[PDB]
């Protein structure tokens, strides 16, 4: 609860206020993660079961959860929960289906036909964390687009025992195989494959430090697999004007704060009275949270910044590029065209972060830690690839032949040039 | 050494024929490059000039190429060459402009508006190698989509002295700044920024072992920059049936072979007679190449494979996922629907690889070394980001509230749930 007046700040203080946590990729975390990966690649299920005996100690037998276990889990859930997941899946499906790239098919010049088509990533592995609270919503976010893309194989790993909600979500979204393996070992299992877990082309979904280091390592190994995106501390940046409701602002700052102790929570507002009221609201609301140590920790790094005007709020946000940008201003919609970097944007007073995290239809797997500079929100595109196709007719080729010969010759690529000459001469003979 | 009959091979030999040689990198190069990157970030232009002094005959002075130097270079080029580059850029521009994503704007349910909009990557840097032969075509392939995407800053680095062709291509495509810096130092200057070189968000363009290692390193450093794609040996796979012309097939195999000594060159054909005729044509054409040493080297790893039929050719190619796929068969277009993995596909007798490398309009920067499994041909998308936006109206929020509360409660994310309750209660108070 200490308001920062942006324009009273020296230039240095301003730079420091927008910095992100320095990375602490423990050489021990990298060492442990590397031994885990090598071990899993070298010994498969044997190594997996060993880690099962140590960590979380659940003594796994069959890595694959059976259809019977999934059916039993599904029967235990309430109809209220099942129906809410269905609303969410429907909206997530609607939004992601609308992302299908329309056909690209054009003749750049007569007889020179260029196309861009799409093909699904053949095999994808989804990761879901464990813990006492089940993060089943991520299953909906990952499995739905994979399904829409037409991915042939879709599997999922989560630390055992896997919660009923996660099993039901997986079945609901067509996940084919669910495996009792978590952490770095799960990522290694998906990247290299084992006797039970298939080697997949791409791995999706965030996790703890070990999971993050694992996804990092396998993405760089030739014998590994591609990953959806780099990771880092999560972030929320709320822009609030004088007409905002302090409790609504506070509720979103706390929604982000409970995500993890390293979460970055930032408010930008042109009114000191708004910052003060939000600070008070945050304090009152925090007092009502039962599991609040995580949020309390994240709030230690929060910044409630008073700017001189809305223009400065936009300028600061664009420089930062927040994972989640929440615009609680009376002209939110009008500001969208000016936002140049953010993972997901929430507009107005009735678009809580919670709406996007669970059921509006947008994806909650987003770039953070500054990766918004070049990465996008997870979407259909991440489960597919663009393939180029071209066909030149005799006429098209003939019209472009001299141009190609000239360019190849200037680059001194003789074989490239001769590929054209051979064809030009064959066409002359047949004319 | 000559013709491989696929079905005569053992299952193990078949798997080996589709493998890619694996080579990573020497500790020596990794060290050398890490030191260059650290020195450039720490000491800027001073470090760049020190590097230049050690390698160039004449130490670099102005790091930025002047408008005058660019103008003098343009004046020396022939009208023929300038006209050829204009045709190429026009076609590249047409195909890439056709890749613009249409608007994604949908109400998943009444009052719940979700959109996906695009924003450009703000600053991009392009790297172009030097050498005796000017590889200026890559400038057209990179700078054109950057312009279409609306990237605010587009700069280029190339080892001095930079050939007139590269300078003209840069100016033609709107590159703002061109810098006299090459190798790993250039990659570091773009990734970190120096007094003269702007720090860019993403770096495009392939290069030698040092450039490749520098791109790998900066892509993994939080203080670095993103890169277009991982690198590796290039590849061509031609599927040819009995109606193909041996010299045309051979010309495309040699076009790829001259790209580099590590290029993978593969022919799949149902006809042993075709394979023999192609092998002979390759030998005869190779003899006419001025500087055939690189092509000869790549050809030692070539595989001319005879299959049972075209369906088997498709099965093999799909398992491999070639960078470039050339289909010289009667019904080439019909086979495309069954192709599941390939960077760029060329159809029929008049679609030489050279056409796509230079002027049909498709991009020649493509995934290889197996990255076709999840990566796409470079396109407009690589110069931009997808950003999602959502706005719920009072009505839309009210209709979705219970669903969000249910899901948040099930995940035990109390703040996420309270964010909803606070708004529901505010609305009741209002009416």
From Swiss-Prot, chains A, B:
Entry binding sites for Zn(2+): 256, 259, 357, 416
Gene3D superfamilies per record:
1.20.5.1300, Nitrogenase molybdenum iron protein domain
What is its pathway? Answer: Amino-acid biosynthesis; L-histidine biosynthesis; L-histidine from 5-phospho-alpha-D-ribose 1-diphosphate: step 9/9
Q: Which reaction does it catalyse?
A: L-histidinol + 2 NAD(+) + H2O = L-histidine + 2 NADH + 3 H(+)
Molecular function (Gene Ontology), one example: histidinol dehydrogenase activity
- Any idea which UniProt keywords this protein has? Amino-acid biosynthesis, Histidine biosynthesis, Metal-binding, NAD, Oxidoreductase, Zinc
InterPro entries, per the entry: Ald_DH/histidinol_DH (IPR016161), Histidinol_DH_CS (IPR001692), Histidinol_DH_monofunct (IPR022695), Hstdl_DH (IPR012131)
Essential cofactor(s) = Zn(2+)
EC category: oxidoreductase
Tell me which residues this entry annotates as catalytic: 323-324
- GO cellular component assignments: cytoplasm; cytosol
UniProt: NAD(+) binding residues = 127, 185, 208
Q: So what does this one do?
A: Catalyzes the sequential NAD-dependent oxidations of L-histidinol to L-histidinaldehyde and then to L-histidine.
The protein's name:
Histidinol dehydrogenase
| Organism of this sequence | Escherichia coli (strain K12)
**Which gene name belongs to this protein?**
hisD
């Amino acid at each position: 609860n200490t308001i920062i007046d942006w324009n009273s700040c020296t230039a240095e203080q301003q730079r420091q206020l927008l910095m992100r946590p320095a990375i602490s990729a423990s050489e021990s975390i990298t060492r442990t993660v590397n031994d885990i990966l090598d071990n899993v690649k070298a010994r498969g299920d044997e190594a997996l079961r060993e880690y099962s005996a140590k960590f979380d100690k659940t003594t796994v037998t069959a890595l694959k959860v059976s259809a019977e276990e999934i059916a039993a889990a599904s029967e235990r859930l309430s109809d209220e929960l099942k129906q809410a997941m269905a609303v969410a899946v429907k909206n997530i499906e609607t939004f992601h289906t609308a992302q299908k790239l329309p056909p690209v098919d054009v003749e750049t010049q007569p007889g020179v036909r260029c196309q861009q088509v799409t093909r699904p990533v053949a095999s994808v592995g989804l990761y879901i964390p464990g813990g006492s609270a089940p993060l089943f919503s991520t299953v909906l976010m990952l499995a739905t687009p994979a399904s829409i893309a037409g991915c042939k194989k879709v599997v999922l790993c989560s630390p055992p025992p896997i919660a009923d909600e996660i099993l039901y979500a997986a079945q609901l979204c067509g996940v084919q195989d669910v495996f009792n393996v978590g952490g770095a070992q799960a990522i290694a299992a998906l990247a290299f494959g084992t006797e039970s877990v298939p080697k997949v082309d791409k791995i999706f979904g965030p996790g703890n430090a070990f999971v993050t280091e694992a996804k990092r390592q396998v993405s760089q190994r030739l014998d590994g697999a591609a990953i959806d995106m780099p990771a880092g501390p999560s972030e929320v940046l709320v822009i609030a004007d004088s007409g905002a409701t302090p409790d609504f602002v506070a509720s979103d700052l706390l929604s982000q704060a409970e995500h993890g102790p390293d979460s970055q929570v930032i408010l930008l507002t042109p009114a000191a009275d708004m910052a003060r009221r939000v600070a008070e609201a945050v304090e009152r609301q925090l007092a009502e949270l039962p599991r609040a140590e995580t949020a309390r920790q994240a709030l230690n790094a929060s910044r409630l910044i008073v700017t001189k005007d809305l223009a400065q709020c936009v300028e600061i946000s664009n420089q930062y590029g927040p994972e989640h940008l929440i615009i609680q201003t009376r002209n939110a919609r009008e500001l969208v065209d000016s936002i140049t970097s953010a993972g997901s944007v929430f507009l107005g007073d009735w678009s809580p972060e919670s709406a996007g995290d669970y059921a509006s239809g947008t994806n909650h797997v987003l770039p953070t830690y500054g990766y918004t500079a070049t990465c996008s929100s997870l979407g259909l595109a991440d489960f597919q690839k663009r393939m180029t196709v071209q066909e030149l007719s005799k006429e098209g080729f003939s019209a472009l032949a001299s141009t190609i010969e000239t360019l190849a010759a200037a680059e001194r690529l003789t074989a490239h040039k001769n590929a054209v000459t051979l064809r030009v001469n064959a066409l002359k003979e047949q004319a």
